[PDB]
């Protein structure tokens, strides 16, 4: 049996458990666990990459060895090479 | 740098070089006189290209929840078209005449339209991205308009409970946008805003703690100061909110 002034007042009165949940739920408050929520990001810069690549193999067809440019970059190669070995020796490998 | 985030800029940027050096060459005279191979294969590429991405952005628009991305996305498919139909044309024309002075035109603007097209779906996808980041702050944001309610320790121990893994995932979601981001006073804003949402977070706890202590017997500096701590973190989280929407 409950009292009715009580009752009526607190019916509709959220609790700090039922407002809390409302906020965590429309908000997304929590971990999430699965491996498809990069996937969307992924495919869209995938695609995106392959437009770039398709349209840069199209001009450098269509520039031939008319081009002035040259990007061989032996000392960032360099750098990487010295990067991985040192990683590699404090791996044990 | 010229892009906001690393992604964006690794994808234009050695695009928009080539396409740079090119307009450079054609000015210089470097390219006169001089026969086009066939370019209908390498646009076959750019045209199967230019397709899986409209495929892959329609299909975001279709699954999205997002109102704002269905609405700015969408021109940007139109945009890679109508410059991909410019890059059959220039190819065509080179196809019919292999010196044809009209097609360099047609070349350039097809190539750039692709591209400007390329960059305003990245730019639109990174926007939603961000609102993705935005909905989790403007969650702690009235999760925390909520710690004036808690006036029991049954509460409090509730409320501390469930904030754990909304700040753990705001904490989460800013340390890889970070990550991404050219801007490095942008970075540095966003590190310190979090930060400081984090080293106030015990003591936002234990200002809550007195309240509902000092509101056994014998209040308003317990009052005062887990507002203060509320208005703080606020203001410190809506700094995070204008930070993440910065793009220059």
């Given at each position: 049996i409950?009292?009715?002034l009580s009752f009526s007042e607190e019916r509709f009165r959220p609790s700090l458990e039922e407002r809390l949940e409302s906020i965590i739920s429309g908000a997304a408050l929590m971990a999430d666990s699965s491996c498809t929520r990069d996937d969307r990001r992924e495919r869209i810069v995938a695609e995106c990459n392959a437009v770039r690549q398709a349209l840069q193999d199209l001009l450098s067809e269509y520039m031939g060895n008319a081009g002035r440019k040259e990007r061989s970059d032996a000392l960032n190669?360099?750098?990487?090479?010295?990067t991985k070995k040192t990683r590699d020796l404090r791996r044990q490998l | 740098?010229?892009?906001?985030?690393?992604?964006?800029e690794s994808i234009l940027e050695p695009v928009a070089q080539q396409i740079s050096h090119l307009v450079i060459m054609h000015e210089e005279g470097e390219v006169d006189g001089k026969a086009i191979p066939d370019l209908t294969a390498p646009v076959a590429a750019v045209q199967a290209a230019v397709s899986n991405l409209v495929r892959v952005g329609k299909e975001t628009v279709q699954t999205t929840e997002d109102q704002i991305l269905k609405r700015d996305m969408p021109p940007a498919f139109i945009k890679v078209e109508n410059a991909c139909t410019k890059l059959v044309q220039?190819?065509?024309?080179?196809?019919?005449?292999?010196?044809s002075v009209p097609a360099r035109d047609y070349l350039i603007?097809?190539?750039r339209g692709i591209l400007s097209g390329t960059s305003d779906l990245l730019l639109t996808f990174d926007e939603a991205e961000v609102?993705?980041?935005?909905?989790?702050?403007?969650?702690?944001?009235?999760?925390?308009?909520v710690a004036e309610v808690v006036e029991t320790m049954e509460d409090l121990v509730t409320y501390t409970k469930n904030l754990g893994p909304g700040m753990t995932k705001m904490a989460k979601m800013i340390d890889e946008r970070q990550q991404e981001l050219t801007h490095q006073e942008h970075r540095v804003m966003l590190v310190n805003s979090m930060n400081?949402?984090?080293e106030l977070l015990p003591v936002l706890i234990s200002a809550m703690k007195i309240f509902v202590t000092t509101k056994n017997s014998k209040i308003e500096e317990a009052?005062?100061?887990?507002?203060?701590t509320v208005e703080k973190m606020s203001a410190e989280i809506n700094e995070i909110i204008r930070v993440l929407q910065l793009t220059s």
């Open positions: 409950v009292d009715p190669s360099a750098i990487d090479k010295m | 740098p010229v892009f906001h985030t690393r992604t964006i220039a190819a065509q024309m080179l196809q019919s005449d292999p010196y603007d097809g190539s609102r993705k980041i935005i909905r989790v702050c403007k969650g702690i944001l009235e999760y925390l308009t400081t949402v984090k009052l005062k100061n887990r507002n203060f």
